[PDB]
Amino acid sequence: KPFKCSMCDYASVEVSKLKRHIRSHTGERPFQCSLCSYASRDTYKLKRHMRTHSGEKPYECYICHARFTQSGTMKMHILQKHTENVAKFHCPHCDTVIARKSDLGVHLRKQHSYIEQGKKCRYCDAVFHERYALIQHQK
């Protein structure tokens, strides 16, 4: 409506939007950096990748003047540093509270995901394949 994707269920109004989405399915990265071996699927992510080469920090916190490469990083810094009563991330499986969303993801794969490279309990010889079960068992 008008342009449905055919593999996944994406659809959007513009032909360029559906073709860019299909580049996400195929893996085509048309726009090559003229400086290194990076290549992007659209023009914007290449322009933004060029800031790493130039080393520019075009965003500045209007409160403490720290500088940042991207706006989202600046916004988040303002949120964690110059703002109170902000919602935190409580893990569903344990009692852990984390300030940032992706750190919660890091926590979930690192403490609550299966690893066949299991660890032995420090005090007995039983082995566990998820760290939280291990540390809880180690009572």
Place this chain on the structure above:
DNA sequence: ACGGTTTCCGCTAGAGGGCG
């Protein structure tokens, strides 16, 4: 106190959406 682990914090880079 001391090493390991957990959380912080700026970083790169991945998607989709609005509009002139």
Place this chain on the structure above:
DNA sequence: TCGCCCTCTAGCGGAAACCG
């Protein structure tokens, strides 16, 4: 239209902070 630019999202890795 579609090229431009925007936010939101996902993870990385060094540093700091926390703990048994």
